[PDB]
Every structure is written in structure tokens, then in C-alpha cells.
Amino acid sequence: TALFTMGGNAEGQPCKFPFRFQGTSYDSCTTEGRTDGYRWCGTTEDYDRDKKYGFCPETA
């Protein structure tokens, strides 16, 4: 699927790859920090700085 926020908080922006989080670069959906089942993506170059994200497809 393509990436949309759809639950996400990043002002309607689609996922940004590669996004930096925990000083580590991610080019795919992560589950770090979510114990609710959902997988998220950063929506900027650096998530650590910005703190705006989107949702990603679970079971991927």
C-alpha cells in the first residue's frame, strides 16, 4: 500500500523514508514505542527533532 497518515498526526503528510529516530535511520515501518498493535513511520528527516509521525501497514 502507499503511506498516508490515517490516524497519524503529521498534518496529512505521507510517511517519510528514511526517517531518523533514536539516532538510528529507518526505511520501513516500526513498532518501537507502540504497545497498541500499530506500526508507525516518521514524517520528516528527523523524528527525534520534529515528533510528527504517520501510521504504517501492520503485518509488515
Side-chain angles (χ1 to χ4, degrees):
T1 169
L3 291 295
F4 305 105
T5 49
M6 46 180 178
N9 70 3
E11 34 283 316
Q13 291 292 85
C15 286
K16 192 64 261 301
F17 297 121
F19 63 103
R20 172 72 38 73
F21 165 58
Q22 301 165 136
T24 309
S25 323
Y26 295 84
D27 209 60
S28 54
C29 305
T30 185
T31 336
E32 291 160 311
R34 296 206 80 103
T35 325
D36 60 11
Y38 312 117
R39 288 171 48 59
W40 66 275
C41 64
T43 11
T44 71
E45 177 181 57
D46 183 34
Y47 177 76
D48 293 319
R49 173 253 259 167
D50 295 301
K51 299 70 152 173
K52 304 303 309 303
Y53 71 97
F55 284 55
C56 236
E58 290 70 31
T59 319

